Design a protein around this ligand. Structure first.
Ligand SMILES: Nc1nc2c(ncn2[C@@H]2O[C@H](COP(=O)(O)OP(=O)(O)O)[C@@H](O)[C@H]2O)c(=O)[nH]1
Ligand SMILES: Nc1nc2c(ncn2[C@@H]2O[C@H](COP(=O)(O)OP(=O)(O)O)[C@@H](O)[C@H]2O)c(=O)[nH]1
Lengths: 235, 232
């Protein structure tokens, strides 16, 4: 079972920490770059190509910093299109990005111009799961208000983001990534990762491992790839 | 007693909250708001920078700040050049609070570009905004990483006493109500030395340490501007 997961976000949002917490243990100029690392998990076979975006914030300039992401995604769509167009399609590789994790910087306030510009330009090319990075920065009052402010700005700009009722209620997911003994040690308290009262991490962790990836795999193949196919052949 | 304090930083770093905690109760473009405090007279013009992050583009987003600071230097220069200098106003920015986004890692290209371009025009106090985001281990490592990158790029931050130099740059948390922030696991106190460097910053202003900042701006920053604009 192969799966391609992309992570896009400003540097220092706990992106790499989240990956290490989702899957146990550890793992510039001129911008922007597109890199990938593969992870094999055995128990059951799991091929996991993780697409990093060594941009991205990050900061000045940032003009068309979404483009290298767009180029990579459409490149893999082009590869799949040319693969099934050949007379001898036998051993076909599938390197299309099934899922994309976008890390929104708190706070907050609303979505920053960069968050709007990326999501509005990538929502029809990849499955986007918006995440409030470093969720332990926000109080329960702020976290709730930040979610509603994001969701209203998503609807306003016509952005199409990707037990089911519990998922829609807590969108976008506020997440905290951590290691050791599991959470983060502050001199006043400890923020637990596997807690529902603390994080939406368990909601995200469940949304991947127990083969919800297959749903993401189907949407990418049936919607995102097919829209690319219809566009590049008509004109 | 008049004082001009500037605050520069990316939106959503708790800048406004810090001002409200430094001075009690509630409160690219360049805007300013005046605050009068009575007990002792305190005229406080707070220069906001409604930029700034924030994001794309950001090219020359430091320029409107530079333009404002040099404009006030120009006003002071033309004031003391006139034959009848009687009631002279002093609107020069005595201090600037720059909010560094955690984390961290090091300083972002924007943090470098601003500080290296404003350190000789204004007194810069670097601050690690929203300090409750970092653990004591991360907070200590983030400080050292910043200070080494300050020295590497030849940035001259306001360096004034031993307790102040030890904790540079100051990691601060701004809050209100009953004083700190309410998390479902713990509470981060503002007036605590174990938690914040807020008390170090609060003390560095209220008890007339502002007069030192006022002297450095007048004797160094303004005089360097004066020597530059007249020699050429
Ligand atoms: N407050 C907070 N800090 C975090 C979180 N995750 C990671 N960090 C810390 O942030 C720093 C940078 O994390 P990193 O994963 O490298 O960020 P990235 O470069 O965007 O992937 C590290 O010192 C982490 O300990 C989080 O969920 N909340
Ligand atoms: N974690 C944390 N949050 C803060 C802090 N200061 C303010 N906030 C929160 O961040 C949000 C934005 O703060 P604000 O002062 O408007 O940021 P500004 O735009 O940079 O001035 C508010 O909801 C505050 O409750 C802080 O020191 N730490």
């Amino acid at each position: 079972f192969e799966f391609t997961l992309m992570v896009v976000g400003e540097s220092g949002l706990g992106k790499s920490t989240l990956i290490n917490s989702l899957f146990l243990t550890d793992l510039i100029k001129k911008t922007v770059q597109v890199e990938q690392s593969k992870v094999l998990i055995k128990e059951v076979q799991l091929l996991l190509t993780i697409v990093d975006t060594p941009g991205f914030g990050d900061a000045v300039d940032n003009s068309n910093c979404w483009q290298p992401v767009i180029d990579y995604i459409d490149s893999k769509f082009e590869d799949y299109l040319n693969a099934e167009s050949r007379v001898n399609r036998r051993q076909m590789p599938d390197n299309r990005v099934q899922c994309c994790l976008y890390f929104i910087a708190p706070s907050g306030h609303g979505l920053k111009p960069l968050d709007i510009e990326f999501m509005k330009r990538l929502h029809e090319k990849v499955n986007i799961i918006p995440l409030i990075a470093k969720a332990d920065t926000l109080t329960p009052e702020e976290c709730q208000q930040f979610k509603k402010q994001i969701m209203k700005e998503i609807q306003e700009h016509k952005i199409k983001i990707y037990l089911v009722k519990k998922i829609k209620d807590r969108l976008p997911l506020a997440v905290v990534g951590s290691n050791t003994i599991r959470g983060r040690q502050y001199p006043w308290g400890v923020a637990e990762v596997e807690n529902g009262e603390h994080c939406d991490f368990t909601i995200l962790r469940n949304m991947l491992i127990r083969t919800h990836m297959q749903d993401l795999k189907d949407v990418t193949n049936n919607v995102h790839y097919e829209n690319y196919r219809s566009r590049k052949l008509a004109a």
